[PDB]
């Protein structure tokens, strides 16, 4: 099977993995994000940029959001 006709839904795209299988992977479009610096997540961790936060939200933490811009305290 290939990535053709696969619909991965919001924030994800199809990529062929190292076992030759099509997979849907977290891939937020960073170009949609207006703030370009680090952010402080609702988990209390700093993310190098907001796109990295959104990738983490997609992969592991569905409730993760930016609680303030810049680095966390």
CA atoms within 13 A of residue 57's CA, in its CB half-sphere: 18
Helix (H, G, I), strand (E, B) or coil at 60: coil
CA distances from 65 to 19, 54, 72 (A): 33, 8, 13
Number of domains in the chain: 1
Q: CA torsion 56→62→65→71, rounded to 10°?
A: -30
- Which element (helix H / strand E) includes 50? helix 50-59
Provide the experimental method for this PDB entry. X-ray
Which domain, by its residues, includes 64?
Answer: 1-73
> b/e string for 16-30 if b means 16 or more Cβ within 10 A?
eeeeeeeeeeebbee
Return the residue matching tokens 């402080």: 40
- C-alpha 66/C-alpha 46 separation (Å) is 9
Which tokens hold the place of 3?
């990535």
Given a contact cutoff of 8 angstroms between Cβ atoms, the answer to whether 65 and 57 are in contact is yes
The CATH number assigned to the domain holding 53 equals 3.30.60.30
Place of tokens 């993310």: 47
């Amino acid at each position: 099977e290939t990535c053709e006709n696969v619909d991965c839904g919001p924030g994800k795209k199809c990529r062929m993995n190292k076992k030759n299988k099509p997979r849907c992977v977290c891939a937020p479009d960073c170009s949609n994000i207006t703030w370009k610096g680090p952010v402080c997540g609702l988990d209390g961790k700093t993310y190098r940029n907001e796109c990295a936060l959104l990738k983490a939200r997609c992969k592991e933490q569905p409730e993760l959001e930016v609680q303030y811009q810049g680095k966390c305290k």
